[model samples]
Target: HHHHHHLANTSAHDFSYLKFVYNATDTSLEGSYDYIVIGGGTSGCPLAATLSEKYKVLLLERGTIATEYPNTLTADGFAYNLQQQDDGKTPVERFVSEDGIDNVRARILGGTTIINAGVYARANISFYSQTGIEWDLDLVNKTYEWVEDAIVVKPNNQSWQSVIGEGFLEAGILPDNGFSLDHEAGTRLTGSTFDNNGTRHAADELLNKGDPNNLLVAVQASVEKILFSSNLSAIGVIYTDSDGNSHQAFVRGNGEVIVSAGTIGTPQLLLLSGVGPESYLSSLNITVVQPNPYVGQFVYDNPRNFINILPPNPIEASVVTVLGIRSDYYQVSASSLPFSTPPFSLFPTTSYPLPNSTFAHIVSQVPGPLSHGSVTLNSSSDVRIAPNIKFNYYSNSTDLANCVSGMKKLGDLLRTKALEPYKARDVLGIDGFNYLGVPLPDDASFETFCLDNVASYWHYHGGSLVGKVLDDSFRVMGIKALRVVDASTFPYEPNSHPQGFYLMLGRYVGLQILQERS
Candidate 1:
């Protein structure tokens, strides 16, 4: 019952045992599969792994293996990977939301798991009721444990992370649920996928746990469209390898086509496949397969603002290991962005230009935002082009009010004595230590700051919302076997961190799938 975090070893997140892995170009993949999952990133890999237990599964990832990017293999590289430039080959994909906020998505074989902060916390109890789907609580607990045992770890907070934890406690968040995985509304140290050794144990590592014989993974395979019959029953997918060679993988017999293509990718892929609003698809010259009115409608990415501090001391690099939650208001997460203990700078000449300067960040964001937006196709045929998407941040008045409250909390935490030790000494210092970027304004200007500095938490979700775009079983309303099993299905973002839930859904949906099929 005690879901304690384990230490990561040398082999953590490694996939040397992946027997069926392919480059998507060397071999022809025109055959059929029991289930063809289009994205092999965070959710897809786990989903394919679970289904591969019984059926022959094919996981076609649009990106290459995470190993190709060394920055993605360890926790120290979190910031570089997060702020990396995308040149059609990098592990990170950068896209500017229509709201004009710069955001990112993981384009590695492991999906966001290759680049996320790696917080492994469970969803709040209310999340189960929020989602219309029937959840087996017992199985859910078991499923969480299944993922925790493999990739999750109890991260030892370095100086920077520890100071922020204390600051959260000092700010009176209450009932310090120290080192917990359950989503309690207060200060707590959550589990992480980054272990003591600073290695990342991501979703791709979980693939080897499945029966390799039944699971075939292809990298550098971009799924351009879903292969649907004239009558519109789910059939298969058409994808192109890196070499521009087209490959087709169909679902044989009663097998289905599952789209675990993440929040952005899922809706964008659906729109391209003619499954979104009929009018929109028609305008794009896409033949309407299933006109789901709410396909790209109710989308949201949690709005995040940061308080960057240039600590006098260089602290060990960390991600969102320390979490602070207010009474359903917002979440305050801490990270060292990306810097080694001694400090180093990234090459300016490369596309991924970054200065690993020493700075600690306390990021604040509203968990469940009322405001929403849409994702429309830029080019109906080209999957490489990012879809026109936006998360109308603060579009709703209540959401703006929530941000005001969250900002106040973050500012209060920054004023606490717990962080005083890290302050730099000088006449020209800010608040005490030098501020990194824009200094936090006084009380009255908080609203303006929240609006101006509003950024993406990278937790953007919705597009194919459950009960609207898809049925309770995660299946598209009118499409028989085409289902979406990713973050896009959620009407509300359940937890402070969604990594645990995303990992669980892969197995959760796979189990539900087999139960129904049987």
Candidate 2:
């Protein structure tokens, strides 16, 4: 029941001494530590909160105070009102931020998940059952239950409250069978980590038991380096401040250093700290700390298709709930296939001979890739090296065809009367802006539509994962104590949006850290 206005009076980042600031310039050298958790974002916060219970923990974040407070805590905040940081979206420079970047990481206390559209979801059950490594499904289920309870993970609420959300219920999209909580089905669906109270129940509300002495959250400090032993053991972190001054400190590492710096940050930091491929570092004239070429390899990003837009006044009549369209359309698609490119392209185009045939057709080709990509040291130089992420987007003609099909499927669903009430005016392509630019009067071509309107979901994944840069417990392979516990460990793109799965993974990793300590 906490309101967004409450944070203004609360003492921020005093959870415990577990979070600190240090960089390369600190005179006092870091000696030893228990666990150094890097990048205090979504999973970082929860993971640190639990880990610090038995072990001394330190959380490092790269940014400071957020412009918007409690808005970052609610899922609906992203849907309607969000005060975004300067992501360099200015007209003069195509740059997206003050830092001259397109990406928006929270660099703040809670990480980007605070600002994400909180579409809470889970991975396919069968996928987990078949993951080769032995796992107790019950354990994973318990973990999921824990996360669900910790955060307000739920389907469209049955209690008719919002005037707009009820329209979907009246239209048949928000009923029980209609909104499968487990899997994504056709029709824009409703999901969230927010309760009616509008509070994000993640670390701040759930994990932080409100003891400033025991819990710690340090914001605005960029962890520049993790100091490890010559034996490759992680001990502590070095960080920099807004003033460019650096400091170093040690935490007790009876556990391990969880490198939850995420897909991009983890690889870049590892390479910068000399834990990546030796040849790549040598090429950049930086000495190799670890010769793991796989450290930065295997980069992957979600290939998204902004399938359909609602025309202005698309709704012809009144309905019960307005915002009932859930984004879980994949479950309906999944019955036919497993996210291969062709069927995804085909679903939107031609009707299949049998129901779910398209999903089955797509799944037949999945686990669809093997050749990987990577992150490399920019020129091998340690100074200001940006992560060269090769998304390695695998869009073959078949894949492209499938994407088109998926678009058709999307259109089919969008055209349904159930979705008519809430769609906003199709505002793409106006003023000669980018993709989905103003729909031409005569262009009904699917091929033309695919080429013009598609954009990635911005959910990049898979680089510097366990068994490559990291081992089974998420420890960097061959490097002692340093582990990665963020979205970077995702081996494949989940059927649903990656954020939900990433949160699931983050919570799962917290237990793993606890197990190691025990």
The candidate that wins on lDDT is 1
Across residues 316-343, which tens digit of lDDT does each residue of candidate 2 receive?
Answer: 2111111223332231211111122221
In model 1, where is the ten-residue run with the lowest total lDDT? 342-351
Off by over 4 Å in 2: 1-32, 65-71, 74-103, 153-180, 184-190, 197-206, 209-214, 251-253, 307-373, 378-386, 419-448
Using TM-score as the measure, the top candidate is 1
lDDT for position 397 in model 2: 44
Clashing pairs in 1: 41-110, 41-111
CA lDDT scores, all candidates in order: 0.79, 0.49
Q: How many residue pairs clash in all the candidates, one count each?
A: 2, 68
